[PDB]
Amino acid sequence: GLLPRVNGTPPPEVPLADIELGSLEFWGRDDDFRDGAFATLRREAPISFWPPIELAGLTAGKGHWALTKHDDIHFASRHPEIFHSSPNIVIHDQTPELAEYFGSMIVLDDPRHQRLRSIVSRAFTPKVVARIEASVRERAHRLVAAMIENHPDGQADLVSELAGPLPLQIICDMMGIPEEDHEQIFHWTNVILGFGDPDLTTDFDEFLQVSMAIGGYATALADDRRVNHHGDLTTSLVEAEVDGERLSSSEIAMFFILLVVAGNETTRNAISHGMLALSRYPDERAKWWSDFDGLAATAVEEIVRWASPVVYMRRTLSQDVDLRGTKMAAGDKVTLWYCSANRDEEKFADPWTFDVTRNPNPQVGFGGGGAHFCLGANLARREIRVVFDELRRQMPDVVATEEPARLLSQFIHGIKRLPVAWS
Ligand code: HEM
Ligand SMILES: CC(=O)OC/C=C(\C)CC/C=C(\C)CCC=C(C)C
Ligand SMILES: [N+]
C-alpha cells in the first residue's frame, strides 16, 4: 500500500464512548479505527444495541443488537428458527416490497428457503461446474493479460480492470449470457451496486428501471433455455426439480439478481483486499509465491478472513433470547458482525497477523455456518486462488501503490479504487 504497517499490528484502543455504529462518520473511518472499535465491543460490550444509520430525510428503521463474538455469531447462524433471515438481511431495507426480488433465497426462512436452495443447488451439475471452473481460469487469465496490454505504463486500477470484472464475467459465463450482452449486464449491475453511494448520483427511478430491466433480461434468458437447452446454469436451473417443484423464470431471475450482487461485489472486495494485504505484507506474498498450489487453501482462506467482504448480516428474532446475560426481544433486529468475529481473540491466535499459512482458520466471512452458508463459497475461493495465480504467473511483482479509495458502507468492506503497478 503506501502506509507502512507491520504485520501483526493491533488496532488502536478505541474507548467505548467513542464507538457509534449508528453513525455514518464511524463507517467512513479507516479499518484501524473500526477494528479497534469492534475489539472494544468484544471485550467490553460484546452484545450491544445500536440505532441504525440515519440517512437524513429518509426512514431509518429500528435499532439492532450487534453480535461481535464469533461464538455468538456462530450460534445465531446455526439457529435460523430463532434468528430469521426474513424479511431481509440488511439493517434497514429501503425497498421491502422487493426484498425477495433482489434477495432470492437469502431473505427466506424455511421451509421456503430450503426448497429454493435445494433446487438451485441441484442445478450445479458436474458439466455446469466444470464449465464454471474453466471460465474462472479463462477470464482471470484474459483479464490479467488485458491489464498488461492496456497498460504499457505498468499501472492500473485493480478494481476496474480485474477485481470488478472477473466475478461478474464468471456469473455471465455460467448463465450462458452472450458476450455481446456483457456491457448491458455490467451497466445494469453497476447501477444496482452503485445506488445509494454518495458519489454515484443514481436516482431511485433509474435504479428501479435498471432493476426491472435486468430481471426481465434474466426471465427472457431463462425462457429461451426452456426451448433451447444449453450446457449453462440457466438451462440447468430451468430443468432442475426437487420433489416435483421447479423454478419459474421469475425465480431464476431473482436468483440471478442476487448473484450479480452477492456473488460479485463480495469476491471483488476479497480480491482487492487480498491484493492490498499481499502488498502490505510482502513476506506473505513471497511465501505464497514460493509454494502457490501448496499454500493456496490457507492463503485464500486467510484472504477471506482478512477481507471479510461482508461486514455483517442482519437477522430478526422470532422469540426472546438471552445470552451473555443480555435479553434480546422477539422482533428485535440482530446483526452478525463477521468483521468482528474474524478478529475474535478467543478463536484466532494472533488475530492481527495476515498469515497465508494460517491453520486452523475458522473464519466466518462466508457466514457463521448453517442454513444460509454462502452457496458460492467454494466458487469464491476458486476465483481468489485463480486470480492470484494468474497475477503470479503474468505480473508476479504486482503491488498496490496507494491506500485504496474505501467504499462508504456498513455492509460491504468495499474498495472503490486500488492502484497497482507491475514490472
Ligand atoms: C469472497 C466472496 C464471498 C463472500 C464473503 C460471501 C459471503 C456470503 C455471506 C456472508 C452469505 C450469508 C451467509 C449466512 O447468512 O450465513 C452469503 C450467501 C450467499 N452467497 Fe456468498 N459470498 C461470496 C461469494 C459468493 C459467490 C461467488 C457466490 C456465487 C454463487 C455467492 C452466492 C451466495 C448465495 C446464493 C447466498 C445465499 C445462500 C442462502 O441464503 O442460502 N457468494 N455469501
Ligand atoms: C442496493 C442493492 O444492492 O440492491 C437492493 C438490495 C437491497 C435493498 C437489500 C440488499 C441485500 C442484498 C442485495 C443481498 C446481498 C448479499 C450479499 C452482498 C452477500
Ligand atoms: N453521524
List the residue whose alpha carbon is closest to atom 12 of ligand 2: 103
Question: What whole-number distance in Å separates Cα of residue 281 and Cα of residue 357?
Answer: 13
* Rounded Cα–Cα distance for residues 27 and 174 (Å): 34
Ligand nearest to the CA of 273: 1
Backbone angles phi, psi at 117, to 5 degrees: -60, -40
Cell representation of residue 414: 468495499
| DSSP secondary structure letters along 185-222 | HHHHHHHHHHTT-SSS---HHHHHHHHHHHHHHHHHHH
Cα–Cα separations (whole angstroms), residue 30 to 3, 8, 369: 12, 17, 28
From the list 99, 79, 78, 77, the residue with the least C-alpha distance to 87 is: 99
Contact 370, 393 (CB under 8 A): no
Q: 180, exposed or middle or buried, with CB in 10 Å at 0-12, 13-18, 19+?
A: exposed
Q: Determine whether the annotation assigns residue 92 to a binding site.
A: no
Cα–Cα dist 243/237, whole Å: 15
Task: State the burial class of residue 309 (Cβ atoms within 10 Å of its Cβ: 0-12, 13-18, 19+).
Answer: buried
| Residues 143-176: b if buried by 16+ CB within 10 A, e if exposed | bbeebeeebeeeebbbbebbbbbbbbbbbbbbbb
Method by which this entry was solved = X-ray
> Is 117 marked within a binding site?
yes
For residue 248, CA distances in Å to 101, 220, 376 come to 13, 11, 21
Q: Are 328 and 321 in contact (CB under 8 A)?
A: yes
Task: Indicate if the alpha-carbon torsion angle 401, 402, 405, 410 is positive or negative.
Answer: positive
* 245, three cell numbers: 417443484
| Cα distance from N-terminal residue to C-terminal residue, the chain | 16
Cell numbers for 230, please give them.
444449453
In angstroms, the CA 61 to CA 40 distance is 25
Chain-centre distance of CA 346, in angstroms? 24
Ligand 1 contacts (CB < 6 A) are 77, 105-106, 117, 258-259, 262-263, 266-267, 270, 304, 309-310, 313, 365-368, 372-376, 379-380
- DSSP, res 365: T
Specify the resolution in Å.
Answer: 1.7
Residue that is written with C-alpha cell 440515519 in the block: 54
Going by alpha carbons, the residue nearest to atom 1 of ligand 3 is 23
DSSP letter at 103 equals H
Give one word for 308, left, alpha or beta, with left for phi > 0 and alpha for psi -120 to 50. Answer: left
For residue 292, what are the contacts with CB-CB under 8 A and spacing of at least 6?
388, 389, 392
Distance from chain centroid for Cα 185:
19
Cα→Cα distances 79→116, 192, 323, Å: 19, 31, 13
Return d(Cα 313, Cα 333) in angstroms, integer. Answer: 10
What residue spans of 281-309 are helical by DSSP H? 282-290, 292-307
Cell of residue 121, nine digits: 443447488
Q: Tell me the C-alpha to C-alpha distance, in Å, between residue 69 and each of 313, 344, 353, 354.
A: 14, 6, 18, 19
Point out residues after which the chain has a gap (C–N over 2.5 Å): none
The Cα–Cα gap between 54 and 65 comes to 16
> What is the set of domains in the chain, with CATH numbers?
16-421 (1.10.630.10)
In the chain, the amino acid numbered 20 is E
Q: How far is the CA of 24 from the centre of ligand 3 (A)?
A: 5
Q: Which of 379, 312, 344 is nearest to 76 (CA)?
A: 312
Query: Rounded to an integer, what distance in angstroms lies between the CA atom of residue 292 and that of residue 125?
Result: 28
Closest alpha carbon to 383 in 182, 167, 224:
167
